[PDB]
Design a protein that fits this description.
Elements lengths: L28 H5 L10 E4 L5 E4 L2 H9 L4 E2 L7 H6 L13 H11 L1 H22 L4 E3 H6 L1 H11 L6 H12 L7 H21 L5 H6 L2 E2 L2 E2 L2 H17 L1 H14 L1 H9 L4 H11 L6 E4 L3 E3 L2 E3 L4 E3 L2 H6 L32 H18 L4 E2 L7 E2 L5 E2 L3 E3 L9
Parallel strand pairs: 2-10
Antiparallel strand pairs: 1-2, 3-7, 4-14, 5-6, 7-10, 8-9, 11-14, 12-13
Helix pairs in contact: 4-5, 5-7, 5-16, 8-9, 8-11, 9-11, 12-16, 14-16
The structure holds protoporphyrin IX containing FE, camphor and potassium ion.
Length: 405
């Protein structure tokens, strides 16, 4: 449906892009979003889809808006409006100044020091999942690796049972790529229904898991409330269950389709960290945004207090004004410009865990299964939303070309 055009929005800026079902989706989701960067499309457009909102289409504007939290508030960061209003996760639903104190606590559970306590288990799980698949000569990559690898690591970190994954993954996905059966508010309250008692049990009897550490944490020297803990833990679950999970499939689809790039990383494994960064640029996948706190003229466009603006993190690095030949993957690219992990005060806190999971996957997969392809006659379908993904990724290989370590 197309919402009525607000009185302050001129017709010439109207471009009815649907972030949950973009028209060019069959080309690939990044390609579908990149239609917003065709030469005739303004830097800032209005879509009547999903209740009506602005979209900044160029890295310059996306970066500026993410830096200016005084005009572009995180209080209502999701489209549609109902979802942004219900959205209350911490720290993401807060602006500075109050946001900042919560970042340190989140860093205690997903930050670089914690990656250190997990490196060996991350390594061991990647290797065991890949070795189990290796002799089969085929897999459904989304279900067989992309999901279980990051999700089981998160569930370990959080001290949550693996048999809870199907329920939690379903709920998480309703917040980013809703199937229509639940509103954001319903999904969020179901997630909170799961968490609240676990949080109370771990405040009564603390363990060493991430939920215990958040629930018994301090924020700038005072105790976190049960409610704040819940709102932080919800966000951590969503990051654990619906970010890397999707990104790995874009990356593995690319490698399945580009033997040259596989060989590069096999021959020059020192390049894997750089490859991770270039893949994070090319297969960027997040798009949230902000709400206007006041009327504001931005790049010659009149914005009105309460207007939502989508600021797609995905688009900055695909912008030819940020990177030449942006749809080309070049592992030797000298300045890999992107906002894949966000920009401004809300920079991703999970990014070190994400990079470790990506780099481990690339190294351990190519060590064992250097030669693989998309299954015969398969046409890979993507899906779009707050976080975009790959619906299915059937891969095949000849087991004779693989190596058990
Ligand atoms: C490829 C993987 C990932 C990508 C692309 C990604 C992307 C992002 C983006 C774009 C933001 C900023 C959102 C905004 O400004 O509104 C963000 C924030 C955040 N992410 Fe990540 N993320 C990833 C992985 C993770 C993981 C694995 C976790 C935790 C398990 C995580 C936890 C967080 C947290 C806690 C924030 C909030 C920071 C704040 O609001 O101050 N992320 N992420
Ligand atoms: C936009 C995000 C990727 C970031 C971490 C999880 C996510 C869906 C959020 O709600 C904040
Ligand atoms: K809100």
């Amino acid at each position: 449906n197309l919402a009525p055009l607000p009185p302050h929005v001129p017709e010439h800026l109207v471009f009815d892009f649907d972030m949950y079902n973009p028209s060019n989706l069959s080309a690939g989701v990044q390609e579908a979003w990149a239609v917003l960067q065709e030469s005739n499309v303004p830097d800032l457009v209005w879509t009547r889809c999903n209740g009506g909102h602005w979209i900044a289409t160029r890295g310059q504007l996306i970066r500026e808006a993410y830096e200016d939290y005084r005009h572009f508030s995180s209080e209502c960061p999701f489209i549609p409006r109902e979802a942004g209003e219900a959205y209350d996760f911490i720290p993401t639903s807060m602006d500075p100044p109050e946001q900042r104190q919560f970042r340190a606590l989140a860093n205690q559970v997903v930050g670089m020091p914690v990656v250190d306590k997990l490196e060996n288990r991350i390594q061991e799980l990647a290797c065991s999942l890949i070795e189990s698949l290796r002799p089969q000569g085929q897999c459904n990559f989304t279900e067989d690796y992309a999901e279980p690898f990051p999700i089981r690591i998160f569930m370990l970190l959080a001290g949550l049972p693996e048999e809870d994954i199907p329920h939690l993954k379903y709920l998480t996905d309703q917040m980013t790529r809703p199937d229509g059966s639940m509103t954001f508010a319903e999904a969020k309250e179901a997630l909170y229904d799961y968490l609240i008692p676990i949080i109370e049990q771990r405040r009564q009897k603390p363990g060493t898991d991430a939920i215990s550490i958040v629930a018994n944490g301090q924020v700038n020297g005072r105790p976190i409330t049960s409610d704040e803990a819940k709102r932080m833990c919800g966000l951590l679950l969503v990051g654990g269950l619906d970010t890397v999970v999707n990104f790995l499939s874009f990356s593995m689809e690319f490698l399945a389709k580009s033997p040259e790039h596989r060989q590069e990383l096999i021959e020059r494994p020192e390049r894997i960290p750089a490859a991770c960064e270039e893949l994070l640029r090319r297969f960027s996948l997040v798009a949230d945004g902000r709400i206007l706190t006041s009327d504001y003229e931005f790049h010659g466009v009149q914005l009105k207090k309460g207007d939502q603006i989508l600021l797609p993190q995905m688009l900055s690095g695909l912008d030819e004004r940020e990177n030449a030949c942006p749809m080309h993957v070049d592992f030797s690219r000298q300045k890999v410009s992107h906002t894949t992990f966000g920009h401004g005060s809300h920079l991703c806190l999970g990014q070190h865990l994400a990079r470790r999971e990506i780099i481990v996957t690339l190294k351990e997969w190519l060590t064992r299964i250097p030669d693989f392809s998309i299954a015969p006659g398969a046409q890979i379908q993507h899906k779009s939303g707050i976080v975009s993904g790959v619906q299915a990724l059937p891969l095949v290989w000849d087991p004779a070309t693989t190596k058990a370590v």
